[PDB]
Amino acid sequence: EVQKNQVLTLEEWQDKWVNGKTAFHQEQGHQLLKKHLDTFLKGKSGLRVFFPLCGKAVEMKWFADRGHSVVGVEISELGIQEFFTEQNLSYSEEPITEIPGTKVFKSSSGNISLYCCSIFDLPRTNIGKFDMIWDRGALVAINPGDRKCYADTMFSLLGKKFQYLLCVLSYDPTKHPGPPFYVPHAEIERLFGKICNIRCLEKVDAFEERHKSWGIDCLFEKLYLLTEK
Ligand SMILES: Nc1ncnc2c1ncn2[C@@H]1O[C@H](CSCC[C@H](N)C(=O)O)[C@@H](O)[C@H]1O
Question: What is the pairing mode between strands 158-170 and 196-205?
Fold first, then answer.
């Protein structure tokens, strides 16, 4: 409960993009996902995959290239345009009618749609249900107090059977206030334990030189696989 009162605003996240402060972005993609990708998609085709707080995650293309439909939500229009530019994809726009002033960016390929609004606006849209969710730099970027609402929101997006892939970071919360925030095993059990079977697939050192700016000297990444209980 040390970071419990941290409250970031959407304007602050949008400013990080405008100012180029996006060190969370991994150009080569998540290595743990890469390792387990073939197993998670074994025997499946044409899945609908959701990427909350997607930024310009290259992993979205990995799924689209394998025949799966991808939907993401990101508050920064700049981040979304950077995704299309870097993946060399053309796109067109459409209004999100239920949330005046916002838009959804759709690739010409028809395989990727990026909603440019808040994840908390989604329940009021017709985004529908998903077979799979890839959550990295998402549950851990959400204001601590908003996590229960975030979890409830995610559940309303899931189909009967699903695979919720979740990445969280393990570090001493008294040394760095976040983001990304500290989401311990207990918090995952509190937020998802009633509805999901929880499996911790991997735990690996993720400390990089850039992390010294956080004031920590230790950093571990854990990959969880949550499925219908
Ligand atoms: N409430 C909210 N709704 C939608 N997007 C949000 C949001 N709060 C933060 N974001 C966006 O959340 C992202 C978190 S960092 C994103 C990283 C991306 N998932 C990756 O793995 O590289 C930022 O791009 C930020 O602009």
Answer: unpaired
The torsion angles phi and psi of 135, rounded to 5 degrees, stand at -115, 100
> Resolution of the deposited coordinates, in angstroms?
1.9
How far is Cα 228 from Cα 127, in angstroms, rounded to an integer? 21
Q: Residue 116's beta-bridge partner residues?
A: 103
> What are the residue ranges spanned by the domains of the chain?
1-229
Check if 57 has its Cβ closer than 6 Å to any atom of ligand 1.
Answer: yes
Atom of ligand 1 nearest to the CA of 30: 21
In 41-174, alpha helices (H)? 59-65, 77-86, 147-155
Residue 172 structure tokens: 């001493």
The method recorded for this entry reads X-ray
Identify whether the C-beta of residue 116 lies closer than 8 Å to the C-beta of residue 106: no
> HSE-up of 175 (CA within 13 Å, CB side)?
12
d(CA 165, CA 30): 12
- Is the distance from the beta carbon of residue 79 to the nearest atom of ligand 1 less than 6 Å? yes
DSSP label of 37: H
Q: Tell me the residue type at 25.
A: H
Give the class (CATH, top level) of 1-229. alpha beta
Q: Does ligand 1 lie within 6 Å of residue 59's CB atom?
A: no
- Give the distance, in angstroms, between the CA of residue 75 and the centroid of all CA atoms in the same chain: 12
Query: 164: CA distance to ligand 1 center in Å?
Result: 17
